[PDB]
Amino acid sequence: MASGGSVIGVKYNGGVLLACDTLLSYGSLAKWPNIPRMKLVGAYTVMCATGDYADFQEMTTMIENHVNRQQMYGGGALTPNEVFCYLQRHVYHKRSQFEPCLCRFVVAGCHGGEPFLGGVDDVGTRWTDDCVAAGYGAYVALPLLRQALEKPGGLTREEAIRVIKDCLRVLFYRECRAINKFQIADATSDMVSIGEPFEVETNWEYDGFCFEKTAIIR
């Protein structure tokens, strides 16, 4: 029961970012710290999930084969909107046979100069928005990203990267099953690229964290 933690995404003026960490856990044990959890689908789309890794692998292998074959056999390249619809009907069908896909997905892409971002949960609920998250990202990160999207005009790429890193910083401080090693995917100009892993800067040296002040008996 290898499992992945949080995923977060946000739209900016010209594209969309998706981020998560490179870790799979088994219960509390941090078992594999060097796992690429984001998967490219066709020409325009990337996906990630929180929860059971085996179910993420089965579902994404199946969708990737359908997309490559439909193109090879003469039925065109599926868009992010169509891929998302297809994913959601598969998750709902499995829920309806009492054999659920125990993951929560985030999907991002770019097609037609128009960015896409959406989530699907394990009973088949679906939504699209300017920011989306799964796992603890839904409690920790959405509040920060929703405040950054309040400014009128939208975010630049640089502002979007900066607020994404503040979110990853808080997940590392406050989510138990996490490591400080993340990747960012960028969908813009009708393609997706995945960056190299990086780490964020953290603060541990406040006066209020010192040995004397935190002592229980004085």
Binding site: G74, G75, G76, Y86
Partner: protein, 221 residues
């Protein structure tokens, strides 16, 4: 003739006779025409006591038939069902090249096995998708042709002769001249054309597949 009774018997010269005879059902149906320009497809048909010859298959696609009507209806129900499933799963129009392939494949299963009969019907399928307008003709042997203009049914050689003179000018034509070329081709396979014996149907850019009413068809007849 010892080789003309079943679909599963090759003749000594490499022919399949039952499939040639099903193809005569089509050639004795009433005539139908199709044409296309850069962004539209037009179908016209002789429907004379009204007999249904044109059918909508989804928002973006329809067809005309010639030959056995009950086989026509069985194919219409199959393609309808396929287009509904595609839209359920993808939220978009079923691509026209995939419709033409599954139809071809369904005809062929009925010419290779003794417990099935060939379909005795020809279709002109017209539609509009993300790669533009398309016009396909399908026949009982299972072949599928992709056309700029064609005609099927009784005396459809005259209609085809007329279209061979004008078709190279159709890409530049507008929707009104394209409809007129389609009626003058159907006229060559023929009493004259009124609003009570002729169907006109259209599909294209910003236009869902539709059949003109008698009001709208007055403008051209």
């Amino acid at each position: 003739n010892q080789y003309d009774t079943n679909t599963t018997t090759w003749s000594p010269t490499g022919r399949l006779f039952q499939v040639e005879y099903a193809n005569e059902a089509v050639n004795n149906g009433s005539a139908a025409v199709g044409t296309k320009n850069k962004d539209f497809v037009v179908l016209t048909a002789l429907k004379r006591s009204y007999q249904e010859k044109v059918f909508k298959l989804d928002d973006h696609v329809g067809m005309a038939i010639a030959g056995l009507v009950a086989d026509g209806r069985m194919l219409a129900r199959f393609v309808r069902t396929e287009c509904m499933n595609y839209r359920y799963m993808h939220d978009s129009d079923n691509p026209l090249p995939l419709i033409a392939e599954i139809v071809g494949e369904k005809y062929q299963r009925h010419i290779q096995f003794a417990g099935k009969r060939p379909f005795g019907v020809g279709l002109l399928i017209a539609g509009y998708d993300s790669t533009g307008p398309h016009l396909y003709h399908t026949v009982p042997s299972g072949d599928v042709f992709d056309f700029k203009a064609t005609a099927m049914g009784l005396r459809s050689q005259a209609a085809r002769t007329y279209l061979e003179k004008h078709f190279e000018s159709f890409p530049d034509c507008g929707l009104d001249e394209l409809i007129m070329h389609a009626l003058k081709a159907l006229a060559a396979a023929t009493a004259e054309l009124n609003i009570k014996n002729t169907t006109i149907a259209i599909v294209g850019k910003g236009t869902p597949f539709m059949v003109l009413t008698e009001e709208a068809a007055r403008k051209y007849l």
